Short mmCIF file of all heavy atoms in Angstrom, two decimals:
data_model
loop_
_atom_site.label_atom_id
_atom_site.label_comp_id
_atom_site.label_asym_id
_atom_site.label_seq_id
_atom_site.Cartn_x
_atom_site.Cartn_y
_atom_site.Cartn_z
N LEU A 70 99.17 -120.09 160.19
CA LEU A 70 98.63 -121.28 159.58
C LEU A 70 98.84 -121.13 158.07
O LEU A 70 99.15 -122.10 157.38
CB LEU A 70 97.16 -121.43 159.93
CG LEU A 70 96.50 -122.74 159.55
CD1 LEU A 70 97.11 -123.89 160.36
CD2 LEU A 70 95.00 -122.67 159.78
N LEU A 71 98.74 -119.91 157.60
CA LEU A 71 99.01 -119.58 156.22
C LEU A 71 100.48 -119.70 155.92
O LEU A 71 100.87 -120.23 154.90
CB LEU A 71 98.50 -118.18 155.83
CG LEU A 71 96.99 -117.99 155.67
CD1 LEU A 71 96.40 -118.97 154.65
CD2 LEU A 71 96.24 -118.07 156.99
N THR A 72 101.31 -119.24 156.87
CA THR A 72 102.75 -119.35 156.76
C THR A 72 103.17 -120.83 156.63
O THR A 72 104.13 -121.17 155.94
CB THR A 72 103.40 -118.75 158.03
OG1 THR A 72 102.80 -117.47 158.28
CG2 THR A 72 104.90 -118.57 157.85
N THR A 73 102.41 -121.71 157.29
CA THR A 73 102.65 -123.13 157.24
C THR A 73 102.29 -123.73 155.86
O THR A 73 102.88 -124.72 155.42
CB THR A 73 101.85 -123.83 158.38
OG1 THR A 73 102.26 -123.24 159.66
CG2 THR A 73 102.11 -125.33 158.42
N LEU A 74 101.36 -123.10 155.17
CA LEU A 74 100.97 -123.56 153.83
C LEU A 74 102.00 -123.04 152.81
O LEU A 74 102.51 -123.78 151.97
CB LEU A 74 99.54 -123.06 153.55
CG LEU A 74 98.84 -123.62 152.31
CD1 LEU A 74 98.59 -125.12 152.46
CD2 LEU A 74 97.53 -122.88 152.06
N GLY A 75 102.28 -121.73 152.89
CA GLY A 75 103.45 -121.06 152.32
C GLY A 75 103.74 -121.27 150.82
O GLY A 75 103.04 -120.71 149.98
N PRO A 76 104.79 -122.08 150.50
CA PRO A 76 105.34 -122.30 149.12
C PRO A 76 104.33 -122.32 147.95
O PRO A 76 104.65 -121.80 146.88
CB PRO A 76 106.00 -123.65 149.25
CG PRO A 76 106.54 -123.67 150.63
CD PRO A 76 105.55 -122.89 151.49
N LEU A 77 103.14 -122.83 148.16
CA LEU A 77 102.19 -122.97 147.07
C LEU A 77 101.65 -121.61 146.60
O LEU A 77 101.25 -121.46 145.45
CB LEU A 77 101.08 -124.00 147.40
CG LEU A 77 100.12 -123.76 148.56
CD1 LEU A 77 99.05 -122.76 148.19
CD2 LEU A 77 99.49 -125.10 148.98
N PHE A 78 101.70 -120.63 147.47
CA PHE A 78 101.22 -119.33 147.14
C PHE A 78 102.34 -118.31 147.22
O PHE A 78 102.11 -117.11 147.44
CB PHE A 78 100.04 -118.96 148.02
CG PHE A 78 100.23 -118.90 149.49
CD1 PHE A 78 100.57 -117.72 150.12
CD2 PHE A 78 100.03 -120.02 150.22
CE1 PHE A 78 100.71 -117.71 151.48
CE2 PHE A 78 100.15 -120.01 151.53
CZ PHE A 78 100.49 -118.85 152.20
N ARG A 79 103.56 -118.78 146.98
CA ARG A 79 104.74 -117.93 146.97
C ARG A 79 104.61 -116.83 145.91
O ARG A 79 104.92 -115.65 146.16
CB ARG A 79 106.01 -118.77 146.73
CG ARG A 79 107.31 -118.00 146.81
CD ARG A 79 108.53 -118.92 146.68
NE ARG A 79 109.80 -118.19 146.77
CZ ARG A 79 110.96 -118.68 147.22
NH1 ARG A 79 111.02 -119.96 147.65
NH2 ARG A 79 112.05 -117.93 147.24
N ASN A 80 104.11 -117.20 144.75
CA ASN A 80 103.84 -116.26 143.68
C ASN A 80 102.35 -115.98 143.65
O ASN A 80 101.54 -116.83 143.25
CB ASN A 80 104.31 -116.78 142.31
CG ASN A 80 104.22 -115.73 141.20
OD1 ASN A 80 103.20 -115.60 140.52
ND2 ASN A 80 105.29 -115.00 140.98
N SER A 81 101.98 -114.83 144.13
CA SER A 81 100.60 -114.42 144.20
C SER A 81 100.51 -112.95 143.87
O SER A 81 101.43 -112.17 144.16
CB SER A 81 100.05 -114.68 145.62
OG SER A 81 100.12 -116.06 145.94
N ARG A 82 99.42 -112.54 143.26
CA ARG A 82 99.21 -111.16 142.91
C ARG A 82 98.57 -110.43 144.08
O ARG A 82 97.63 -110.95 144.69
CB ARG A 82 98.36 -111.00 141.66
CG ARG A 82 98.19 -109.58 141.20
CD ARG A 82 97.39 -109.48 139.92
NE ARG A 82 98.02 -110.21 138.82
CZ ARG A 82 98.66 -109.67 137.76
NH1 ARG A 82 99.02 -108.38 137.80
NH2 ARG A 82 98.98 -110.41 136.73
N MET A 83 99.07 -109.28 144.40
CA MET A 83 98.58 -108.50 145.53
C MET A 83 97.45 -107.57 145.08
O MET A 83 97.66 -106.70 144.24
CB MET A 83 99.71 -107.72 146.18
CG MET A 83 100.80 -108.60 146.76
SD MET A 83 102.20 -107.67 147.44
CE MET A 83 103.22 -109.00 148.06
N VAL A 84 96.30 -107.79 145.63
CA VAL A 84 95.13 -106.95 145.38
C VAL A 84 94.81 -106.20 146.64
O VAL A 84 94.66 -106.79 147.71
CB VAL A 84 93.91 -107.75 144.83
CG1 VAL A 84 94.16 -108.12 143.40
CG2 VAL A 84 93.66 -109.01 145.64
N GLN A 85 94.75 -104.94 146.53
CA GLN A 85 94.64 -104.11 147.70
C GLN A 85 93.18 -103.86 148.05
O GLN A 85 92.42 -103.35 147.24
CB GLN A 85 95.39 -102.80 147.46
CG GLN A 85 95.87 -102.14 148.73
CD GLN A 85 96.82 -100.98 148.43
OE1 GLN A 85 96.39 -99.84 148.29
NE2 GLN A 85 98.07 -101.28 148.29
N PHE A 86 92.83 -104.26 149.27
CA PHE A 86 91.47 -104.15 149.77
C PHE A 86 91.30 -102.91 150.64
O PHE A 86 91.76 -102.86 151.76
CB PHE A 86 91.09 -105.41 150.59
CG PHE A 86 90.73 -106.66 149.80
CD1 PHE A 86 91.68 -107.36 149.04
CD2 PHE A 86 89.46 -107.16 149.87
CE1 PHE A 86 91.32 -108.51 148.36
CE2 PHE A 86 89.10 -108.30 149.18
CZ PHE A 86 90.02 -108.98 148.43
N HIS A 87 90.64 -101.93 150.07
CA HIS A 87 90.38 -100.71 150.81
C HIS A 87 88.95 -100.76 151.31
O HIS A 87 88.00 -100.86 150.53
CB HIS A 87 90.54 -99.49 149.87
CG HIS A 87 90.42 -98.15 150.54
ND1 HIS A 87 89.22 -97.59 150.95
CD2 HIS A 87 91.37 -97.27 150.88
CE1 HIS A 87 89.48 -96.40 151.48
NE2 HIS A 87 90.78 -96.16 151.48
N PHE A 88 88.79 -100.69 152.63
CA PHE A 88 87.47 -100.79 153.23
C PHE A 88 86.85 -99.43 153.50
O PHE A 88 87.56 -98.41 153.62
CB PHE A 88 87.51 -101.56 154.53
CG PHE A 88 87.80 -103.01 154.39
CD1 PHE A 88 88.94 -103.58 154.95
CD2 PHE A 88 86.92 -103.82 153.70
CE1 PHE A 88 89.17 -104.93 154.83
CE2 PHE A 88 87.16 -105.17 153.57
CZ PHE A 88 88.28 -105.73 154.14
N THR A 89 85.55 -99.42 153.57
CA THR A 89 84.80 -98.26 153.90
C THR A 89 84.18 -98.42 155.29
O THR A 89 84.07 -99.56 155.81
CB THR A 89 83.72 -97.97 152.83
OG1 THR A 89 82.93 -99.15 152.61
CG2 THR A 89 84.37 -97.56 151.51
N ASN A 90 83.81 -97.32 155.91
CA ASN A 90 83.25 -97.35 157.26
C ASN A 90 81.81 -97.81 157.28
O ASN A 90 80.91 -97.06 156.88
CB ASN A 90 83.36 -95.99 157.96
CG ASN A 90 84.77 -95.59 158.33
OD1 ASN A 90 85.49 -95.01 157.54
ND2 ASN A 90 85.16 -95.92 159.54
N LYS A 91 81.59 -99.03 157.71
CA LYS A 91 80.24 -99.52 157.91
C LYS A 91 80.08 -100.02 159.34
O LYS A 91 79.61 -99.28 160.20
CB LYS A 91 79.87 -100.59 156.87
CG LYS A 91 79.64 -100.05 155.45
CD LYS A 91 78.44 -99.11 155.40
CE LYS A 91 78.21 -98.58 154.01
NZ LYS A 91 77.01 -97.71 153.93
N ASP A 92 80.48 -101.25 159.60
CA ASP A 92 80.40 -101.77 160.96
C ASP A 92 81.64 -101.40 161.71
O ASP A 92 82.69 -101.96 161.48
CB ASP A 92 80.22 -103.30 161.00
CG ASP A 92 78.88 -103.77 160.57
OD1 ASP A 92 77.89 -103.53 161.30
OD2 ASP A 92 78.76 -104.38 159.51
N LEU A 93 81.50 -100.45 162.60
CA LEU A 93 82.63 -99.93 163.33
C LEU A 93 83.19 -100.93 164.32
O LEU A 93 84.40 -101.08 164.43
CB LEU A 93 82.28 -98.60 164.03
CG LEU A 93 81.82 -97.46 163.11
CD1 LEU A 93 81.49 -96.21 163.92
CD2 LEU A 93 82.88 -97.14 162.07
N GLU A 94 82.29 -101.67 165.00
CA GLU A 94 82.72 -102.74 165.92
C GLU A 94 83.56 -103.74 165.18
O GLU A 94 84.67 -104.07 165.59
CB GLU A 94 81.53 -103.50 166.51
CG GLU A 94 80.62 -102.76 167.45
CD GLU A 94 79.59 -103.70 168.02
OE1 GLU A 94 79.93 -104.50 168.93
OE2 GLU A 94 78.44 -103.73 167.53
N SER A 95 83.03 -104.18 164.06
CA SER A 95 83.64 -105.22 163.30
C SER A 95 84.90 -104.70 162.59
O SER A 95 85.83 -105.44 162.42
CB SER A 95 82.63 -105.77 162.28
OG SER A 95 83.05 -106.98 161.70
N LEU A 96 84.92 -103.42 162.23
CA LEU A 96 86.09 -102.79 161.63
C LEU A 96 87.24 -102.85 162.62
O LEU A 96 88.30 -103.36 162.32
CB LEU A 96 85.78 -101.34 161.25
CG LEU A 96 86.91 -100.49 160.65
CD1 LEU A 96 87.33 -101.03 159.30
CD2 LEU A 96 86.50 -99.05 160.56
N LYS A 97 86.99 -102.36 163.82
CA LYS A 97 87.99 -102.35 164.85
C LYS A 97 88.33 -103.77 165.24
O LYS A 97 89.49 -104.06 165.45
CB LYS A 97 87.52 -101.58 166.08
CG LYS A 97 87.22 -100.09 165.80
CD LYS A 97 88.43 -99.33 165.32
CE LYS A 97 88.10 -97.89 165.07
NZ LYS A 97 89.27 -97.09 164.64
N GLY A 98 87.36 -104.65 165.31
CA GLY A 98 87.63 -106.03 165.69
C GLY A 98 88.38 -106.80 164.61
O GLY A 98 89.09 -107.72 164.91
N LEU A 99 88.17 -106.43 163.37
CA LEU A 99 88.91 -107.00 162.25
C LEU A 99 90.38 -106.54 162.39
O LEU A 99 91.33 -107.30 162.23
CB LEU A 99 88.31 -106.52 160.90
CG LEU A 99 88.94 -107.02 159.61
CD1 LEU A 99 88.71 -108.52 159.44
CD2 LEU A 99 88.38 -106.27 158.42
N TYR A 100 90.53 -105.28 162.72
CA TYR A 100 91.82 -104.70 163.04
C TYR A 100 92.45 -105.40 164.27
O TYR A 100 93.66 -105.71 164.29
CB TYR A 100 91.68 -103.18 163.26
CG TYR A 100 91.82 -102.34 162.00
CD1 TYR A 100 90.76 -102.15 161.13
CD2 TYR A 100 93.02 -101.74 161.69
CE1 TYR A 100 90.89 -101.41 159.98
CE2 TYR A 100 93.18 -100.99 160.54
CZ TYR A 100 92.12 -100.83 159.70
OH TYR A 100 92.28 -100.06 158.57
N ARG A 101 91.60 -105.64 165.26
CA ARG A 101 91.96 -106.36 166.48
C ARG A 101 92.44 -107.76 166.16
O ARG A 101 93.46 -108.21 166.65
CB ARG A 101 90.76 -106.48 167.45
CG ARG A 101 90.23 -105.18 168.09
CD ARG A 101 91.20 -104.51 169.05
NE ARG A 101 92.33 -103.84 168.41
CZ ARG A 101 92.47 -102.52 168.34
NH1 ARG A 101 91.44 -101.72 168.62
NH2 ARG A 101 93.64 -101.99 167.95
N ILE A 102 91.66 -108.44 165.34
CA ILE A 102 91.90 -109.85 165.06
C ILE A 102 93.15 -110.04 164.19
O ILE A 102 93.97 -110.90 164.51
CB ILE A 102 90.62 -110.54 164.48
CG1 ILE A 102 90.63 -112.02 164.78
CG2 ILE A 102 90.45 -110.30 162.98
CD1 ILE A 102 89.37 -112.75 164.38
N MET A 103 93.32 -109.21 163.16
CA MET A 103 94.52 -109.29 162.31
C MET A 103 95.76 -108.97 163.10
O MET A 103 96.78 -109.65 162.98
CB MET A 103 94.45 -108.39 161.09
CG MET A 103 94.00 -109.09 159.80
SD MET A 103 92.33 -109.73 159.85
CE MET A 103 92.19 -110.35 158.17
N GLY A 104 95.64 -107.97 163.98
CA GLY A 104 96.76 -107.55 164.81
C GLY A 104 97.09 -108.62 165.84
O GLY A 104 98.25 -108.74 166.27
N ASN A 105 96.09 -109.39 166.21
CA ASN A 105 96.26 -110.49 167.15
C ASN A 105 97.06 -111.63 166.49
O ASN A 105 97.73 -112.39 167.16
CB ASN A 105 94.86 -111.00 167.60
CG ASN A 105 94.91 -112.03 168.70
OD1 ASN A 105 95.79 -112.03 169.56
ND2 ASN A 105 93.93 -112.92 168.70
N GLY A 106 97.00 -111.67 165.16
CA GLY A 106 97.73 -112.67 164.43
C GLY A 106 96.83 -113.45 163.51
O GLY A 106 96.81 -114.68 163.53
N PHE A 107 96.09 -112.74 162.69
CA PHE A 107 95.14 -113.38 161.81
C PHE A 107 95.26 -112.91 160.38
O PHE A 107 95.87 -111.87 160.11
CB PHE A 107 93.68 -113.19 162.30
CG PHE A 107 93.21 -114.15 163.37
CD1 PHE A 107 93.75 -114.13 164.64
CD2 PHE A 107 92.21 -115.05 163.08
CE1 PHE A 107 93.27 -115.01 165.60
CE2 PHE A 107 91.74 -115.92 164.02
CZ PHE A 107 92.26 -115.91 165.29
N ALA A 108 94.72 -113.70 159.52
CA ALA A 108 94.60 -113.48 158.12
C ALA A 108 93.18 -113.92 157.80
O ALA A 108 92.49 -114.42 158.70
CB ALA A 108 95.61 -114.33 157.38
N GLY A 109 92.74 -113.79 156.60
CA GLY A 109 91.39 -114.22 156.32
C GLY A 109 91.26 -114.99 155.04
O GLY A 109 91.91 -114.65 154.04
N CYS A 110 90.48 -116.00 155.08
CA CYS A 110 90.21 -116.83 153.95
C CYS A 110 89.05 -116.22 153.19
O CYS A 110 87.95 -116.12 153.71
CB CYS A 110 89.79 -118.22 154.43
SG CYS A 110 89.74 -119.50 153.19
N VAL A 111 89.28 -115.78 152.00
CA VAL A 111 88.24 -115.22 151.19
C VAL A 111 87.71 -116.31 150.29
O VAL A 111 88.42 -116.76 149.39
CB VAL A 111 88.72 -114.03 150.34
CG1 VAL A 111 87.62 -113.51 149.46
CG2 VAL A 111 89.23 -112.91 151.23
N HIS A 112 86.52 -116.75 150.55
CA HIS A 112 85.93 -117.79 149.80
C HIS A 112 84.98 -117.24 148.75
O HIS A 112 84.06 -116.45 149.08
CB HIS A 112 85.21 -118.79 150.72
CG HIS A 112 84.56 -119.95 150.01
ND1 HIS A 112 85.21 -120.76 149.11
CD2 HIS A 112 83.28 -120.39 150.05
CE1 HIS A 112 84.34 -121.66 148.66
NE2 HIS A 112 83.15 -121.48 149.20
N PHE A 113 85.21 -117.61 147.52
CA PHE A 113 84.33 -117.31 146.43
C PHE A 113 83.31 -118.44 146.39
O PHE A 113 83.67 -119.60 146.16
CB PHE A 113 85.11 -117.18 145.11
CG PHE A 113 85.99 -115.95 145.02
CD1 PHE A 113 87.16 -115.83 145.76
CD2 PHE A 113 85.63 -114.89 144.18
CE1 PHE A 113 87.95 -114.68 145.65
CE2 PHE A 113 86.42 -113.76 144.07
CZ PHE A 113 87.57 -113.67 144.81
N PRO A 114 82.02 -118.11 146.65
CA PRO A 114 80.92 -119.09 146.78
C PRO A 114 80.90 -120.19 145.72
O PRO A 114 81.09 -119.92 144.50
CB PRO A 114 79.67 -118.23 146.66
CG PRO A 114 80.08 -116.92 147.24
CD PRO A 114 81.53 -116.73 146.85
N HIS A 115 80.68 -121.43 146.17
CA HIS A 115 80.60 -122.59 145.31
C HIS A 115 79.35 -122.55 144.47
O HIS A 115 78.32 -123.16 144.75
CB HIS A 115 80.68 -123.93 146.06
CG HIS A 115 82.03 -124.24 146.64
ND1 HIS A 115 82.21 -124.79 147.90
CD2 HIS A 115 83.24 -124.16 146.08
CE1 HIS A 115 83.51 -125.02 148.06
NE2 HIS A 115 84.20 -124.66 146.98
N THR A 116 79.41 -121.72 143.48
CA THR A 116 78.40 -121.51 142.51
C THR A 116 79.11 -120.99 141.27
O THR A 116 78.84 -121.40 140.15
CB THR A 116 77.36 -120.45 142.97
OG1 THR A 116 76.86 -120.83 144.27
CG2 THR A 116 76.19 -120.35 142.01
N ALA A 117 80.07 -120.11 141.51
CA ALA A 117 80.90 -119.61 140.47
C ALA A 117 82.32 -119.41 141.00
O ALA A 117 82.69 -118.32 141.40
CB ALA A 117 80.35 -118.31 139.88
N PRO A 118 83.09 -120.49 141.10
CA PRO A 118 84.46 -120.45 141.57
C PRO A 118 85.41 -120.44 140.37
O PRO A 118 86.44 -121.13 140.34
CB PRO A 118 84.56 -121.79 142.31
CG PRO A 118 83.57 -122.72 141.65
CD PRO A 118 82.71 -121.87 140.76
N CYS A 119 85.01 -119.64 139.40
CA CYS A 119 85.70 -119.51 138.13
C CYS A 119 87.11 -118.96 138.32
O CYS A 119 87.31 -117.76 138.59
CB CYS A 119 84.86 -118.62 137.22
SG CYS A 119 83.18 -119.21 136.99
N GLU A 120 88.09 -119.88 138.19
CA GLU A 120 89.50 -119.63 138.43
C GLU A 120 89.77 -119.36 139.90
O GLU A 120 90.28 -120.24 140.62
CB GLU A 120 90.08 -118.50 137.56
CG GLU A 120 90.14 -118.80 136.08
CD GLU A 120 90.76 -117.66 135.29
OE1 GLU A 120 92.00 -117.55 135.28
OE2 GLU A 120 90.02 -116.88 134.69
N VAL A 121 89.36 -118.21 140.37
CA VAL A 121 89.60 -117.85 141.71
C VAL A 121 88.49 -118.43 142.59
O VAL A 121 87.30 -118.19 142.39
CB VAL A 121 89.74 -116.31 141.88
CG1 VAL A 121 88.48 -115.55 141.49
CG2 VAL A 121 90.20 -115.95 143.28
#
Side-chain angles (χ1 to χ4, degrees):
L70 190 65
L71 285 305
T72 312
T73 302
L74 189 65
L77 63 77
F78 61 92
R79 184 175 181 152
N80 187 271
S81 300
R82 184 178 300 254
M83 297 176 179
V84 286
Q85 204 170 92
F86 282 68
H87 185 284
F88 291 118
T89 52
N90 289 89
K91 289 295 181 178
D92 289 290
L93 300 180
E94 292 185 77
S95 194
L96 178 66
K97 299 298 181 178
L99 181 67
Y100 271 83
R101 293 294 73 109
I102 206 173
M103 263 64 176
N105 186 31
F107 278 67
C110 192
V111 178
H112 181 53
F113 289 72
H115 290 138
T116 307
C119 304
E120 293 182 79
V121 63

